[PDB]
Amino acid sequence: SRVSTRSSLAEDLRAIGLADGDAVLVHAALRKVGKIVGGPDDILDAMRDVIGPAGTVLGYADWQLEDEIRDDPAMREHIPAFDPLRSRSIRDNGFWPELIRTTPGALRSASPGASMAAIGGEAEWFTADHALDYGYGPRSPLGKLVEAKGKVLMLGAPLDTMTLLAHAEHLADFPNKRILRYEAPILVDGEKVWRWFEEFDTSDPPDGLADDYFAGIVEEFLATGRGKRGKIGEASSVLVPADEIVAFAVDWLERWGRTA
Amino acid sequence: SRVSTRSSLAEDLRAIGLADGDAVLVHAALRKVGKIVGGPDDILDAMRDVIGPAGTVLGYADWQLEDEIRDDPAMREHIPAFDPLRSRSIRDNGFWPELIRTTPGALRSASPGASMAAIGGEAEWFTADHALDYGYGPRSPLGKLVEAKGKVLMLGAPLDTMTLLAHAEHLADFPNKRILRYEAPILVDGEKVWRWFEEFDTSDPPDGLADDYFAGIVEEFLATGRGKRGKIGEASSVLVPADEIVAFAVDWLERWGRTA
Ligand SMILES: CC(C)(COP(=O)(O)OP(=O)(O)OC[C@H]1O[C@@H](n2cnc3c(N)ncnc32)[C@H](O)[C@@H]1OP(=O)(O)O)[C@@H](O)C(=O)NCCC(=O)NCCS
Ligand SMILES: CC(C)(COP(=O)(O)OP(=O)(O)OC[C@H]1O[C@@H](n2cnc3c(N)ncnc32)[C@H](O)[C@@H]1OP(=O)(O)O)[C@@H](O)C(=O)NCCC(=O)NCCS
Ligand SMILES: CN[C@@H]1[C@@H](O[C@H]2O[C@H](CO)[C@@H](N)[C@H](O)[C@H]2O)O[C@H]2C[C@@H](N)[C@@H](O[C@H]3[C@H](O)[C@@H](O)[C@H](N)C[C@@H]3N)O[C@@H]2[C@@H]1O
Ligand SMILES: CN[C@@H]1[C@@H](O[C@H]2O[C@H](CO)[C@@H](N)[C@H](O)[C@H]2O)O[C@H]2C[C@@H](N)[C@@H](O[C@H]3[C@H](O)[C@@H](O)[C@H](N)C[C@@H]3N)O[C@@H]2[C@@H]1O
Ligand SMILES: [Cl-]
């Protein structure tokens, strides 16, 4: 029965630990926030108020081409190329990355399935030079979030949607990492070309693990007393430092893979 | 029962009457088109291929401020002012105006409740200088649609959502037109100010007619033979000359006003 404002959301964000100059990747379930006077745009505006102009807000866009269409040779010349300026975010990830992507000023990185939207003082740097292959590795917004000592805010989102952990999956040395190869269309100086891609499998976990095991790792991280929980509006939310939870998740995975 | 492509939708638009250099207002129910390979963006892409670069495609954006919150004094300072670059389309008009508005190169006119989104060769003209009061009058994208001799296409949409006919309500001489007055926040060169507004009532029909009466007027115009029906992908869709349906509607309303 409580309605949120740009001002009250800024206090909530400061209360969970958002600070001046932060860079924050956000995963959101916006319905959990509850009634907002100015719609969910008040959340992004509140965040920009807190972190200031030097800060950056990010979201995981991906794109909408499903595998079964991509793999259907009949529709091959009817599939539109991925275009960081025009391709819309995968709807599976909710409105939040679309909200960012279509805010004037936002930029969107180049590696389609891993592509990120960002707005703020380092939006250019965070989206620049996104490797097409292994796009969850060091040459990616996720690696740059670790380098920048950014944060990840789960805004009512289930903890297994923390995509930053796919970057730990990339770094961790464990046996039998599944490698995925696929063909997708992209623009090379404004013209459509089909390109072969390669990356570590993000869609399914390492064999032996439950499909939602990212959530277990996050809770085990919060159990050490690092990170913070809080209400953003009415959404139960989590804020964690990106570098710490990736080091935690790397050795969680490296230790598990040794037992096999 | 089949998939539509940017090229399949292209030939469907040419058969309804879309032609080179056209400027067309679109009201859409996109779930009625069926499955499209590259999503509803393939619709707007097709149209811009049919009409060519001099063409122009429009949508009725409006905005999301709710009367209730607007008229709550306690919420006054928390209302985001209307911003033609940022305030999102009213969701009751469907995704289509948002689809246009969030396309790079697209423009949005200044008068909030009557705001229109536009992309194409004449997008700057169709959106320039939209009057804040009586925003369905002559100083309006709908007035310019008549002057440009454009078209309207109901793309699976209920024919009573044809907003151009509100422009016929502004123009037609019939007694007891209901004037609406309200205060609303608007961005004036980046700064929010509350401004009083007035216009003819678009939210309820003139006292004496059914709510969906716009619809019966449309198909009656179709009985004259001066419209064209046809299926866009899977959607039953109507295309109509703008200048003629206004005159047909104006005379309809003025003639009916005397009987009353
Ligand atoms: C799946 C998931 C998104 C569902 O969350 P949800 O709250 O149900 O859906 P969304 O987050 O899209 O938010 C919905 C709110 O959009 C607002 N919204 C959407 N578009 C809007 C618009 N154009 N204008 C105003 N509001 C809009 C609404 O409040 C809509 O709610 P309503 O339609 O019920 O009114 C959530 O559980 C989740 O998993 N989030 C994280 C996803 C992620 O980042 N995944 C990474 C890869 S694993
Ligand atoms: C109310 C009305 C809009 C409902 O239409 P609808 O087809 O059910 O809904 P929309 O037209 O918004 O289109 C829905 C399709 O959006 C696609 N779409 C929406 N957003 C998308 C996105 N971001 N990315 C990819 N696809 C998206 C989907 O196919 C969505 O369907 P799904 O959610 O079932 O998959 C329609 O009946 C109507 O009355 N239209 C006319 C509105 C108008 O012009 N009013 C004028 C003022 S009175
Ligand atoms: C860990 N579980 C996740 C699942 O959870 C969601 O669906 C479940 C269905 O039972 C629900 N129980 C659960 O509540 C809900 O959150 O959603 C699927 C969606 C699917 N397109 C893919 O996305 C991945 C992309 O394929 C990949 O490209 C991207 N990099 C990462 C995406 N997560 O894999 C995830 C993953 O399997
Ligand atoms: C006449 N019907 C319309 C309704 O759609 C539905 O109407 C009937 C129910 O009422 C249904 N039977 C019908 O299937 C369906 O089309 O949507 C509402 C949405 C509301 N924001 C307002 O928009 C108006 C704006 O408020 C106003 O600012 C603008 N100028 C004109 C808009 N129509 O009034 C319309 C109008 O009442
Ligand atoms: Cl995918």
Author numbering:
A (entry chain A), B (entry chain B): 3 to 262
What's in the article?
Here, we conduct a comprehensive functional analysis of the Antibiotic_NAT family of aminoglycoside acetyltransferases. AG resistance is primarily conferred by three classes of aminoglycoside-modifying enzymes (AMEs): phosphotransferases (APHs), nucleotidylyltransferases (ANTs), and acetyltransferases (AACs). AMEs permanently alter the AG substrate, preventing them from binding to their target, the A-site of the 16S rRNA in the bacterial ribosome. The fold typical of the Antibiotic_NAT family is evident in all structures, composed of 13 α-helices and 8 β-strands, and determined structures superpose with pairwise RMSD’s 0.8–1.0 Å between 197 to 266 matching Cα atoms.
Notably, the meta-AAC0038 enzyme was also active against apramycin which inspired our structural analysis of this activity. Using the catalytically inactive His168Ala mutant of this enzyme, we were able to determine the crystal structures of ternary meta-AAC0038H168A•apramycin•CoA and the binary meta-AAC0038H168A•acetyl-CoA complexes. In line with the previously discussed Antibiotic_NAT enzyme structures, meta-AAC0038 accommodated the substrates in the negatively charged cleft formed by the minor subdomain, with the 3-N group of apramycin located within 2.6 Å of the sulfhydryl group of CoA. Notably, the I and III rings of apramycin were positioned out from the active site cleft and did not form interactions with the enzyme except for hydrogen bonds with the Asp94 and Asp162 sidechains. The ability to retain this AG molecule in the active site via very few contacts could explain the activity of meta-AAC0038 on this substrate resulting in the low-level resistance to apramycin which was not detected for the other representatives of Group 3 Antibiotic_NAT enzymes. According to our meta-AAC0038-apramycin complex structure, the binding of apramycin to this enzyme differed from its interactions to AAC(3)-IVa. The meta-AAC0038 and AAC(3)-IIIb structures superimpose with RMSD 0.54 Å across 219 Cα atoms, share all the minor subdomain structural elements, and show complete conservation of AG binding residues. However, the position corresponding to Glu223 in AAC(3)-IIIb is occupied by Asp213 in meta-AAC0038. Glu223 is positioned at the ring I binding site of apramycin, which may impact the ability of AAC(3)-IIIb to accommodate this AG as a substrate.
